[PDB]
């Protein structure tokens, strides 16, 4: 309700580059699975979330390389003995290859 | 399920009838071979279905 005004001094245009506009690492997926589906499966896409989908749909054709970071968190159930240091395998299946069923 | 469409055919039709002498056999055979030129290329190496 306060109508405040400030003097704005700006210079430079490297901030509004499309490389910087679309070069922000954002969440694309987030899934939880139990000990025993039994594993994580997801086809890579941008349209999963509305914000990133709208950001990308401002252009017709975009060509880019994808950098993927997987951040796993483990939460225990029911006595306590600590968080196990379980080994995780993450595999990329190209479009011309079969995907696991179990 | 998506499968690449047909890329053409190579067909053989019998223009005349086979003519052989009396002593020669009345049945013959044709065998074929295939190859690729120096402009062939491949990408995205995968696992062959043939076990």
PDB file of C-alpha atoms in Angstrom:
ATOM      1  CA  UNK A   1       0.000   0.000   0.000  1.00  0.00           C
ATOM      2  CA  UNK A   2       3.121   2.176   0.125  1.00  0.00           C
ATOM      3  CA  UNK A   3       3.912   3.857  -3.205  1.00  0.00           C
ATOM      4  CA  UNK A   4       7.701   3.989  -3.023  1.00  0.00           C
ATOM      5  CA  UNK A   5      10.008   4.932  -5.889  1.00  0.00           C
ATOM      6  CA  UNK A   6      13.744   4.405  -6.345  1.00  0.00           C
ATOM      7  CA  UNK A   7      16.264   5.654  -8.890  1.00  0.00           C
ATOM      8  CA  UNK A   8      17.381   2.768 -11.108  1.00  0.00           C
ATOM      9  CA  UNK A   9      20.836   2.804 -12.709  1.00  0.00           C
ATOM     10  CA  UNK A  10      21.536  -0.045 -15.131  1.00  0.00           C
ATOM     11  CA  UNK A  11      24.078  -0.906 -17.808  1.00  0.00           C
ATOM     12  CA  UNK A  12      24.895  -4.004 -19.819  1.00  0.00           C
ATOM     13  CA  UNK A  13      22.799  -6.630 -21.582  1.00  0.00           C
ATOM     14  CA  UNK A  14      24.623  -9.917 -20.926  1.00  0.00           C
ATOM     15  CA  UNK A  15      22.014 -10.797 -18.294  1.00  0.00           C
ATOM     16  CA  UNK A  16      19.163 -11.095 -20.815  1.00  0.00           C
ATOM     17  CA  UNK A  17      21.019 -13.467 -23.146  1.00  0.00           C
ATOM     18  CA  UNK A  18      18.981 -16.512 -24.137  1.00  0.00           C
ATOM     19  CA  UNK A  19      21.882 -18.639 -22.911  1.00  0.00           C
ATOM     20  CA  UNK A  20      21.404 -17.114 -19.459  1.00  0.00           C
ATOM     21  CA  UNK A  21      17.605 -17.054 -19.742  1.00  0.00           C
ATOM     22  CA  UNK A  22      17.373 -20.799 -20.386  1.00  0.00           C
ATOM     23  CA  UNK A  23      20.614 -21.865 -18.696  1.00  0.00           C
ATOM     24  CA  UNK A  24      19.179 -22.257 -15.202  1.00  0.00           C
ATOM     25  CA  UNK A  25      19.327 -25.688 -13.583  1.00  0.00           C
ATOM     26  CA  UNK A  26      15.738 -26.372 -12.542  1.00  0.00           C
ATOM     27  CA  UNK A  27      13.873 -29.333 -11.116  1.00  0.00           C
ATOM     28  CA  UNK A  28      12.416 -31.447 -13.913  1.00  0.00           C
ATOM     29  CA  UNK A  29      11.283 -34.469 -11.898  1.00  0.00           C
ATOM     30  CA  UNK A  30      10.943 -35.652  -8.315  1.00  0.00           C
ATOM     31  CA  UNK A  31       9.811 -39.166  -7.410  1.00  0.00           C
ATOM     32  CA  UNK A  32       9.845 -41.369  -4.318  1.00  0.00           C
ATOM     33  CA  UNK A  33      10.037 -45.158  -4.338  1.00  0.00           C
ATOM     34  CA  UNK A  34      10.147 -47.731  -1.557  1.00  0.00           C
ATOM     35  CA  UNK A  35      12.633 -50.500  -0.803  1.00  0.00           C
ATOM     36  CA  UNK A  36      10.660 -53.116  -2.765  1.00  0.00           C
ATOM     37  CA  UNK A  37       7.434 -49.465  -8.477  1.00  0.00           C
ATOM     38  CA  UNK A  38      10.713 -50.913  -7.220  1.00  0.00           C
ATOM     39  CA  UNK A  39      12.900 -48.392  -9.068  1.00  0.00           C
ATOM     40  CA  UNK A  40      12.924 -44.972 -10.717  1.00  0.00           C
ATOM     41  CA  UNK A  41      11.931 -44.578 -14.369  1.00  0.00           C
ATOM     42  CA  UNK A  42      11.188 -41.330 -16.186  1.00  0.00           C
ATOM     43  CA  UNK A  43      11.456 -40.160 -19.785  1.00  0.00           C
ATOM     44  CA  UNK A  44      13.340 -36.869 -19.957  1.00  0.00           C
ATOM     45  CA  UNK A  45      11.182 -33.878 -20.865  1.00  0.00           C
ATOM     46  CA  UNK A  46      10.823 -30.182 -20.086  1.00  0.00           C
ATOM     47  CA  UNK A  47       7.011 -29.786 -20.012  1.00  0.00           C
ATOM     48  CA  UNK A  48       6.678 -31.572 -16.620  1.00  0.00           C
ATOM     49  CA  UNK A  49       6.360 -28.302 -14.675  1.00  0.00           C
ATOM     50  CA  UNK A  50       4.367 -25.299 -15.842  1.00  0.00           C
ATOM     51  CA  UNK A  51       7.038 -22.671 -15.171  1.00  0.00           C
ATOM     52  CA  UNK A  52       9.793 -24.320 -17.199  1.00  0.00           C
ATOM     53  CA  UNK A  53       7.307 -25.361 -19.888  1.00  0.00           C
ATOM     54  CA  UNK A  54       6.200 -21.754 -20.346  1.00  0.00           C
ATOM     55  CA  UNK A  55       9.830 -20.607 -20.313  1.00  0.00           C
ATOM     56  CA  UNK A  56      10.708 -23.025 -23.121  1.00  0.00           C
ATOM     57  CA  UNK A  57       7.537 -22.539 -25.186  1.00  0.00           C
ATOM     58  CA  UNK A  58       8.463 -18.923 -25.946  1.00  0.00           C
ATOM     59  CA  UNK A  59      10.565 -20.385 -28.786  1.00  0.00           C
ATOM     60  CA  UNK A  60       9.734 -22.820 -31.577  1.00  0.00           C
ATOM     61  CA  UNK A  61      13.075 -24.630 -31.980  1.00  0.00           C
ATOM     62  CA  UNK A  62      15.686 -24.955 -29.227  1.00  0.00           C
ATOM     63  CA  UNK A  63      18.858 -27.042 -29.492  1.00  0.00           C
ATOM     64  CA  UNK A  64      20.802 -27.684 -26.304  1.00  0.00           C
ATOM     65  CA  UNK A  65      22.873 -30.178 -24.347  1.00  0.00           C
ATOM     66  CA  UNK A  66      21.425 -31.502 -21.101  1.00  0.00           C
ATOM     67  CA  UNK A  67      23.302 -31.660 -17.791  1.00  0.00           C
ATOM     68  CA  UNK A  68      21.626 -33.903 -15.217  1.00  0.00           C
ATOM     69  CA  UNK A  69      22.240 -33.846 -11.463  1.00  0.00           C
ATOM     70  CA  UNK A  70      20.678 -36.496  -9.216  1.00  0.00           C
ATOM     71  CA  UNK A  71      20.232 -35.611  -5.541  1.00  0.00           C
ATOM     72  CA  UNK A  72      19.059 -38.628  -3.518  1.00  0.00           C
ATOM     73  CA  UNK A  73      17.661 -38.428   0.000  1.00  0.00           C
ATOM     74  CA  UNK A  74      16.829 -41.415   2.201  1.00  0.00           C
ATOM     75  CA  UNK A  75      14.269 -41.472   5.026  1.00  0.00           C
ATOM     76  CA  UNK A  76      13.926 -44.441   7.373  1.00  0.00           C
ATOM     77  CA  UNK A  77      10.755 -46.069   8.699  1.00  0.00           C
ATOM     78  CA  UNK A  78       9.878 -47.348  12.184  1.00  0.00           C
ATOM     79  CA  UNK A  79      14.068 -48.879  16.170  1.00  0.00           C
ATOM     80  CA  UNK A  80      16.806 -46.782  14.555  1.00  0.00           C
ATOM     81  CA  UNK A  81      20.295 -47.676  13.369  1.00  0.00           C
ATOM     82  CA  UNK A  82      21.385 -44.906  10.974  1.00  0.00           C
ATOM     83  CA  UNK A  83      21.065 -44.020   7.311  1.00  0.00           C
ATOM     84  CA  UNK A  84      22.640 -46.709   5.097  1.00  0.00           C
ATOM     85  CA  UNK A  85      25.194 -45.712   2.478  1.00  0.00           C
ATOM     86  CA  UNK A  86      23.425 -47.572  -0.305  1.00  0.00           C
ATOM     87  CA  UNK A  87      24.961 -47.651  -3.773  1.00  0.00           C
ATOM     88  CA  UNK A  88      22.802 -46.178  -6.531  1.00  0.00           C
ATOM     89  CA  UNK A  89      22.928 -46.879 -10.262  1.00  0.00           C
ATOM     90  CA  UNK A  90      21.610 -44.304 -12.735  1.00  0.00           C
ATOM     91  CA  UNK A  91      21.425 -45.406 -16.368  1.00  0.00           C
ATOM     92  CA  UNK A  92      20.483 -43.389 -19.446  1.00  0.00           C
ATOM     93  CA  UNK A  93      18.533 -45.405 -22.026  1.00  0.00           C
ATOM     94  CA  UNK A  94      18.541 -43.805 -25.505  1.00  0.00           C
ATOM     95  CA  UNK A  95      15.396 -43.678 -27.624  1.00  0.00           C
ATOM     96  CA  UNK A  96      16.372 -46.760 -29.633  1.00  0.00           C
ATOM     97  CA  UNK A  97      16.950 -49.120 -26.717  1.00  0.00           C
ATOM     98  CA  UNK A  98      14.711 -51.122 -24.373  1.00  0.00           C
ATOM     99  CA  UNK A  99      14.078 -50.033 -20.801  1.00  0.00           C
ATOM    100  CA  UNK A 100      14.193 -52.282 -17.719  1.00  0.00           C
ATOM    101  CA  UNK A 101      11.035 -53.851 -16.347  1.00  0.00           C
ATOM    102  CA  UNK A 102      12.303 -54.771 -12.867  1.00  0.00           C
TER     103      UNK A 102
ATOM    104  CA  UNK B   1       4.999 -48.628 -31.429  1.00  0.00           C
ATOM    105  CA  UNK B   2       6.828 -46.716 -34.169  1.00  0.00           C
ATOM    106  CA  UNK B   3       8.695 -48.406 -37.026  1.00  0.00           C
ATOM    107  CA  UNK B   4      10.545 -46.695 -39.863  1.00  0.00           C
ATOM    108  CA  UNK B   5       8.553 -46.700 -43.088  1.00  0.00           C
ATOM    109  CA  UNK B   6       9.569 -48.639 -46.181  1.00  0.00           C
ATOM    110  CA  UNK B   7      12.619 -47.360 -48.056  1.00  0.00           C
ATOM    111  CA  UNK B   8      11.860 -48.966 -51.424  1.00  0.00           C
ATOM    112  CA  UNK B   9      11.867 -52.314 -53.165  1.00  0.00           C
ATOM    113  CA  UNK B  10      13.959 -54.190 -55.717  1.00  0.00           C
ATOM    114  CA  UNK B  11      11.744 -56.394 -57.874  1.00  0.00           C
ATOM    115  CA  UNK B  12      12.347 -58.915 -60.649  1.00  0.00           C
ATOM    116  CA  UNK B  13       9.897 -59.875 -63.396  1.00  0.00           C
ATOM    117  CA  UNK B  14      10.389 -62.512 -66.074  1.00  0.00           C
ATOM    118  CA  UNK B  15      10.374 -60.692 -69.420  1.00  0.00           C
ATOM    119  CA  UNK B  16      10.570 -63.779 -71.655  1.00  0.00           C
ATOM    120  CA  UNK B  17      10.517 -67.506 -70.974  1.00  0.00           C
ATOM    121  CA  UNK B  18      13.667 -69.441 -70.152  1.00  0.00           C
ATOM    122  CA  UNK B  19      15.125 -71.232 -73.183  1.00  0.00           C
ATOM    123  CA  UNK B  20      17.483 -74.177 -72.686  1.00  0.00           C
ATOM    124  CA  UNK B  21      18.801 -76.931 -74.984  1.00  0.00           C
ATOM    125  CA  UNK B  22      17.519 -80.479 -74.720  1.00  0.00           C
ATOM    126  CA  UNK B  23      20.675 -81.715 -72.988  1.00  0.00           C
ATOM    127  CA  UNK B  24      20.749 -78.873 -70.451  1.00  0.00           C
ATOM    128  CA  UNK B  25      18.701 -78.883 -67.266  1.00  0.00           C
ATOM    129  CA  UNK B  26      15.203 -77.421 -67.395  1.00  0.00           C
ATOM    130  CA  UNK B  27      15.599 -75.576 -64.070  1.00  0.00           C
ATOM    131  CA  UNK B  28      18.111 -72.848 -63.217  1.00  0.00           C
ATOM    132  CA  UNK B  29      18.905 -70.699 -60.187  1.00  0.00           C
ATOM    133  CA  UNK B  30      19.854 -67.105 -59.376  1.00  0.00           C
ATOM    134  CA  UNK B  31      21.811 -65.908 -56.336  1.00  0.00           C
ATOM    135  CA  UNK B  32      22.239 -62.380 -55.035  1.00  0.00           C
ATOM    136  CA  UNK B  33      24.646 -60.326 -52.954  1.00  0.00           C
ATOM    137  CA  UNK B  34      24.444 -57.023 -51.093  1.00  0.00           C
ATOM    138  CA  UNK B  35      26.979 -54.441 -49.955  1.00  0.00           C
ATOM    139  CA  UNK B  36      27.381 -50.766 -49.089  1.00  0.00           C
ATOM    140  CA  UNK B  37      29.336 -47.920 -50.643  1.00  0.00           C
ATOM    141  CA  UNK B  38      31.915 -45.628 -49.053  1.00  0.00           C
ATOM    142  CA  UNK B  39      29.165 -43.123 -48.179  1.00  0.00           C
ATOM    143  CA  UNK B  40      27.466 -45.381 -45.621  1.00  0.00           C
ATOM    144  CA  UNK B  41      27.467 -44.284 -41.990  1.00  0.00           C
ATOM    145  CA  UNK B  42      26.232 -45.398 -38.579  1.00  0.00           C
ATOM    146  CA  UNK B  43      25.489 -43.734 -35.252  1.00  0.00           C
ATOM    147  CA  UNK B  44      24.362 -44.475 -31.688  1.00  0.00           C
ATOM    148  CA  UNK B  45      25.825 -47.930 -31.156  1.00  0.00           C
ATOM    149  CA  UNK B  46      23.395 -50.177 -29.283  1.00  0.00           C
ATOM    150  CA  UNK B  47      22.866 -53.805 -28.255  1.00  0.00           C
ATOM    151  CA  UNK B  48      22.047 -56.220 -31.058  1.00  0.00           C
ATOM    152  CA  UNK B  49      18.827 -58.215 -30.481  1.00  0.00           C
ATOM    153  CA  UNK B  50      20.457 -61.384 -31.858  1.00  0.00           C
ATOM    154  CA  UNK B  51      21.338 -63.370 -28.743  1.00  0.00           C
TER     155      UNK B  51
END
